[PDB]
Design a protein around this ligand. Structure first.
Ligand SMILES: NC(=O)C1=CN([C@@H]2O[C@H](COP(=O)(O)OP(=O)(O)OC[C@H]3O[C@@H](n4cnc5c(N)ncnc54)[C@H](OP(=O)(O)O)[C@@H]3O)[C@@H](O)[C@H]2O)C=CC1
Lengths: 204, 219
């Protein structure tokens, strides 16, 4: 439809991160009016987006998983079923240390922890993804926890793509809301019938 | 502009022909992307005045009048203030100054008991409390406003606390009109989000340059 023409200027631009060690990073999610991501007609856009990124963090993109605590498992996942049926890629799993036992077909990005933050060094992580795993572009889709952090990272994020659904999920839903104010620039809105989509960049 | 035609069906006198004992109520407010109305834009201002000029009354909770000391004006609508603790003072407010300058009407103040200190030119709406919620009965309040003060239609600009309640009342709210700006106020700002899921119907969107507006009705 006209929706790709709408997205076009916000997709990875190759000459932009070429000759840099950082990948293109887009932040994308779907929220209700009350800014909640949990507790149509979106699916076309999301799939289109996915097929314009090398990696997707949560041809066909490679799944990337944050799992520093090392509880997650590829064996017996839906993602593994898709992979076996030749319609999906195996994951890259972000860890802090080399796992004692590893899984067949799984890659492990060993990424250091930022000394100031309690959490993981995002810029480092994305560099590892690009330099070690040839991920030239990544679409991060979720962890409201993850969204909330990266909203603060204008030195990292390149595109912001938000779908807003014409509904209220309720106050106990998990919210996306950065801990400080965040300004946008180069915004562009699209309107559907029940949805609206925002494309933008992060100022600074 | 295309904004009046976008709003047309959602205004009080697209409510058509029947008389009602409850006034036409629209719930309307401007939020950040993270659903915040406060901190922790051009074109919105004109629409807001346009909306105001089409309502008999404009309702805000206390706090809204205590944070901003708002004019609530636009001939123009009667300000209606929910202040059951009787802590707001018309005397020396922006609203008084507008009233003294013939640019605004004096306010109706909603209380739950006999007003202790009555200010000149102010009207007091003594409304029953909802025994179930312990708060003021919204339905009775709106009916009193229509019966005792001749308010045929009311625009609640809110207070998040008021919007969070009223978002649940499909039996009261006739229209919902929300402006979403493309910024984040941050989690410390005061949010509008109801305690339970709310479904909408008859929704239509309007997109401006940096903002978008939703008109809808409560399912
Ligand atoms: N940018 C925008 O479009 C909007 C901005 N805002 C702003 O954001 C802020 C939000 O307001 P907020 O702090 O949530 O509070 P509110 O302005 O909604 O008012 C809260 C108070 O009003 C009284 N009240 C509300 N409902 C009842 C009831 N059913 N019975 C009795 N009393 C009731 C209570 O007063 P009490 O218990 O003290 O007697 C309550 O504590 C305000 O500053 C407002 O101006 C709000 C809406 C939209």
């Amino acid at each position: 439809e006209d929706l790709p023409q709408f997205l076009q200027n916000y997709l990875p631009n190759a000459g932009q991160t070429e000759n840099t060690i950082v990948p293109f990073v887009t932040l994308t999610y779907a929220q209700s009016l009350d800014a909640r991501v949990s507790r149509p007609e979106t699916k076309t856009m999301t799939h289109y987006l996915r097929h314009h990124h090398d990696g997707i963090l949560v041809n066909s993109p490679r799944p990337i998983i944050i799992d520093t605590k090392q509880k997650w498992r590829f064996d017996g996942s839906k993602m593994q079923e898709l992979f076996i049926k030749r319609q999906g890629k195996p994951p890259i799993v972000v860890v802090t240390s080399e796992p004692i036992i590893k899984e067949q077909h799984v890659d492990y990005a060993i990424c250091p922890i930022n000394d100031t933050t309690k959490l993981v060094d995002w810029k480092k992580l994305f560099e590892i993804l690009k330099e070690e795993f040839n991920i030239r572009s990544v679409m991060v889709e979720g962890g409201a926890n993850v969204i909330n952090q990266l909203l603060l990272r204008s030195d990292i994020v390149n595109s912001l793509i938000i779908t807003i659904g014409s509904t209220f999920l309720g106050s106990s839903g998990t919210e996306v809301s950065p801990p400080q104010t965040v300004n946008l620039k180069d915004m562009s809105w699209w309107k559907g019938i029940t949805d609206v989509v925002l494309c933008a960049r992060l100022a600074d």
